[PDB]
Design an enzyme around this catalytic site. Structure first.
Site, short mmCIF file in Angstrom:
data_model
loop_
_atom_site.label_atom_id
_atom_site.label_comp_id
_atom_site.label_asym_id
_atom_site.label_seq_id
_atom_site.Cartn_x
_atom_site.Cartn_y
_atom_site.Cartn_z
CG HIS A 39 31.57 29.40 41.01
ND1 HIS A 39 29.65 29.02 40.54
CD2 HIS A 39 31.28 30.15 42.45
CE1 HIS A 39 29.59 30.07 41.20
NE2 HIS A 39 30.36 30.55 41.82
N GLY A 141 27.79 37.19 44.70
CA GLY A 141 27.44 36.45 46.04
C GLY A 141 25.71 35.75 45.39
CB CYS A 143 26.95 31.83 42.09
SG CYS A 143 27.54 32.55 40.73
C1 LIG Z 1 28.18 34.01 42.25
O1 LIG Z 1 27.78 34.71 42.75
C2 LIG Z 1 29.00 34.67 40.41
C3 LIG Z 1 27.85 35.79 39.74
C4 LIG Z 1 28.63 36.75 38.62
C5 LIG Z 1 29.63 37.89 39.57
C6 LIG Z 1 29.27 38.84 38.64
N1 LIG Z 1 28.24 38.75 38.19
C7 LIG Z 1 27.16 36.94 37.82
O2 LIG Z 1 26.90 36.91 37.26
N2 LIG Z 1 30.04 34.27 39.62
C8 LIG Z 1 31.02 34.47 39.64
O3 LIG Z 1 32.11 34.83 39.85
C9 LIG Z 1 31.26 33.16 38.59
C10 LIG Z 1 32.24 32.19 38.82
C11 LIG Z 1 33.52 31.07 38.14
C12 LIG Z 1 33.67 30.25 38.62
C13 LIG Z 1 32.26 30.78 36.58
N3 LIG Z 1 32.53 34.09 37.74
C14 LIG Z 1 32.43 35.47 36.06
O4 LIG Z 1 30.89 35.29 35.95
O5 LIG Z 1 32.86 35.43 35.80
C15 LIG Z 1 33.12 36.91 35.03
C16 LIG Z 1 32.74 38.25 35.50
C17 LIG Z 1 32.60 39.24 35.59
C18 LIG Z 1 34.71 37.91 35.66
O6 LIG Z 1 32.13 37.76 37.00
C19 LIG Z 1 32.68 38.41 38.29
C20 LIG Z 1 33.60 37.55 38.77
C21 LIG Z 1 34.12 37.91 40.64
C22 LIG Z 1 33.95 39.30 40.79
CL1 LIG Z 1 34.86 40.07 42.16
C23 LIG Z 1 33.25 39.94 39.88
C24 LIG Z 1 33.01 39.69 38.25
#
Ligand SMILES: *[C@H](O)[C@H](C[C@@H]1CCNC1=O)NC(=O)[C@H](CC(C)C)NC(=O)OCC(C)(C)Oc1ccc(Cl)cc1
Ligand SMILES: *[C@H](O)[C@H](C[C@@H]1CCNC1=O)NC(=O)[C@H](CC(C)C)NC(=O)OCC(C)(C)Oc1ccc(Cl)cc1
EC number: 3.4.19.12
Lengths: 299, 299
Positions: A39, A141, A143
């Site tokens: 991603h 950040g 991931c």
């Molecule tokens: C990658 O760095 C990130 C890690 C999570 C962010 C929040 N806590 C995590 O472990 N992964 C993602 O943002 C992921 C990407 C998808 C394409 C799989 N999305 C995700 O984890 O969605 C759940 C929510 C709560 C929406 O996470 C967040 C996404 C974006 C933001 Cl700005 C804040 C939280």
């Protein structure tokens, strides 16, 4: 007795920064390959329902910026394997440790090196829950941060971080890109089903308690494997088996407490609670130490 | 939200093995000096009441065997500074990180790299308790293991491990050899007095709880600094001060919860208990995260 992580130095030297567009996360640099979550190629408008095959088709080697410290690496190939990208680079990591990729079993533990921008921020110990989530500490950040075990001088990588679920727990993949559990890498509401308690680990921790002088919860009863499990099921504990009993062998031996005796004490704790008392400084029953972890720590 | 240690790699490269006679423990190798606990020179028949000055007089440079991996280092000088020995060696450690020696304050936290035979076994986070003990995980052979903080690329060493007290808690020195607390390096019964709870850290952790969505313990009352402290004293909590209030500033701001409001919720928790509920997955009130730790982790 403490939640203890593996020393992180061998892994620290594998962490790099990977940017595609304005999305940045961490990669794992071993030999001449950098592994990261696929991603990284998504914009925020792609994360709701990405077609990763189509998105990656618009990407070339030079759209992947890989940075190790102040040093940009040259990407000379790319391919998608399940939910991870493999970026072939023109320099093999001189810090590559002895390593393997393993898919861990639920109930097993590992250390997480939480990273941001390719830089390590901290280390902690996690269990793969029976429902294939982990109770981590991850921000945006993070991931591409990895989980690992160390055996001697060999690092066994078992986890790469991808996502947070609505319950606040975390999901990710092995290093071939296959998710643990039913999860998919898209920003939709996803359920981890019921979690269950890792019974053999609770027993290992009760044994660790006894080893460290805490003995108040021991009673004069015993039980049967089938009788205990009738209580386990009641509390969403995993059923206990003879392999578990055998795995506890070393601890049962070091303590002279039969596993089924310890089971009877556990039954009373589940039924009567802990009456405001504590075990190894905790007021809940701890299930994220394996028998091996307890042996390792108390040896 | 997790108990998170600093990445240990910079410290791993400083650990060595030090043997005098049949006593072996760990040393810390920085530039051309190896630091270790002076009781390395004791036999088991010396540990009850050592005269260290007299014991060290019978030791020469060549009686100190220092091993880094498969490599024996050559000891070219030795001296005793408080409760540590400094062994001058003929090779400066090529892995010496940027570093300083600091004497930490009670209530502050640090990471421990637990080592045996000069080899790192694991990493975990500790607080210096108000009574100058730490609740570590240490076995025979762990002495000379160190505690540290990392600021940027600089390692601040603050603790070297020496002993276990009858209560199972641990005592040691700063890197100049001065014990934290009233302890002496001899195998006699020694008391750490009453321990107290690190109030500002409990508040920081309650703020961390709120940040992570756990809000049930919040009430509609407030209190006064002097009124709370009348409750603090009752429970062997440290008194709260305006400097504490100010240190909590960033957290109070991020949450919109006045510190004295959070104090009123803490008073109710101390008085009424937690009614079987949990906060950040713990059924007790956690005091080994500083405000800085909470900011660092939730940022
Ligand atoms: C990658 O760095 C990130 C890690 C999570 C962010 C929040 N806590 C995590 O472990 N992964 C993602 O943002 C992921 C990407 C998808 C394409 C799989 N999305 C995700 O984890 O969605 C759940 C929510 C709560 C929406 O996470 C967040 C996404 C974006 C933001 Cl700005 C804040 C939280
Ligand atoms: C140094 O490696 C060792 C660390 C403690 C051993 C047990 N847990 C520790 O943290 N330090 C000592 O053995 C210390 C040496 C004195 C000269 C200061 N003695 C000590 O800590 O005494 C307390 C007891 C419980 C006696 O510790 C033990 C000493 C020896 C043995 Cl074989 C077992 C425990």
């Amino acid at each position: 007795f403490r939640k203890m992580a593996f020393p992180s130095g061998k892994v620290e030297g594998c962490m790099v920064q990977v940017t595609c567009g304005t999305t940045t996360l961490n990669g794992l640099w071993l030999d001449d390959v950098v592994y990261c979550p696929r991603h990284v190629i998504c914009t925020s408008e792609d994360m709701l329902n990405p077609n990763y095959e189509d998105l990656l088709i618009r990407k070339s080697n030079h759209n992947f910026l890989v940075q190790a410290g102040n040093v940009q690496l040259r990407v000379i190939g790319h391919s998608m394997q399940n939910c991870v990208l493999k970026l072939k680079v023109d320099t093999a990591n001189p810090k590559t440790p002895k390593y393997k990729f393993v898919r861990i079993q639920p109930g097993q533990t590992f250390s997480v090196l939480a990273c941001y921008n390719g830089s390590p921020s901290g280390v902690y110990q996690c269990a793969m829950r029976p429902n294939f989530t982990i109770k981590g500490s991850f921000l945006n950040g993070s991931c591409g941060s990895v989980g690992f075990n160390i055996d001697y001088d060999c690092v066994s990588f078992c986890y790469m971080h991808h996502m947070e679920l609505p319950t606040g727990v975390h999901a990710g993949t092995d290093l071939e890109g296959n998710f643990y559990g039913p999860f998919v890498d898209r920003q939709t509401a996803q359920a981890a089903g019921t979690d269950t308690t890792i019974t053999v680990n609770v027993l290992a921790w009760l044994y660790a308690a006894v080893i460290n002088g805490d003995r108040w919860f021991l009673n004069r009863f015993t039980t049967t494997l089938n009788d205990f499990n009738l209580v386990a099921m009641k509390y969403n504990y995993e059923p206990l088996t003879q392999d578990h009993v055998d795995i506890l062998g070393p601890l049962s031996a070091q303590t002279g407490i039969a596993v089924l005796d310890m089971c009877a004490s556990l039954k009373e704790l589940l039924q009567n609670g802990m009456n405001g008392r504590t075990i190894l400084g905790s007021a809940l029953l701890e299930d994220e130490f394996t028998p091996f972890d307890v042996v390792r720590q108390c040896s």
